[PDB]
Design a protein around this ligand. Sequence first.
Ligand code: HEM
Ligand SMILES: O=Nc1ccccc1
Length: 153
Amino acid sequence: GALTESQAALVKSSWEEFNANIPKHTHRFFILVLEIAPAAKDLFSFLKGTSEVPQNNPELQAHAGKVFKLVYEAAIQLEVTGVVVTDATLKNLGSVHVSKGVADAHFPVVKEAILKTIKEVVGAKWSEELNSAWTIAYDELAIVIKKEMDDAA
Ligand code: HEM
Ligand SMILES: O=Nc1ccccc1
């Protein structure tokens, strides 16, 4: 696919639709995560000691929303420029993931949870052309964070 002017216009459009409801899309996102792998729960300070995923936890919201923002920006940056660029932030991201005890085999958990989440968010507009475009953008961004973890470990 590469990222045509038309495929990029499709991810933008679809991220806008996600941000449009953070407390919902974020709590959805944590549940799809815990469906795909329940053990993951002891990772999160705000989920530990709990029984269910808190639904108005500020810490939870603020953190999951940052995740999706970062995938979208990665997709424009691929249509424009042709690539995803590794900055200070991505590098600190990788430190924190290591302290919390996160590994690589964790990443398809969070990708499926995200493709599924965007499938749910765009509904009938969904096209092959679009799945292809978020897949490209997540894969290309994961490639970069993993890189930074490995580096913090
Ligand atoms: C491209 C894919 C990913 C992106 C963009 C991303 C982004 C983030 C960000 C931005 C934060 C910190 C939020 C804050 O400090 O304000 C964070 C924290 C965290 N992330 Fe990820 N993430 C990704 C994949 C993963 C995976 C695969 C896991 C494994 C389950 C994970 C587990 C965690 C944990 C446990 C924390 C600490 C939360 C705490 O104890 O309060 N992340 N991530
Ligand atoms: O997937 N990484 C996450 C970031 C912040 C909070 C929870 C998860």
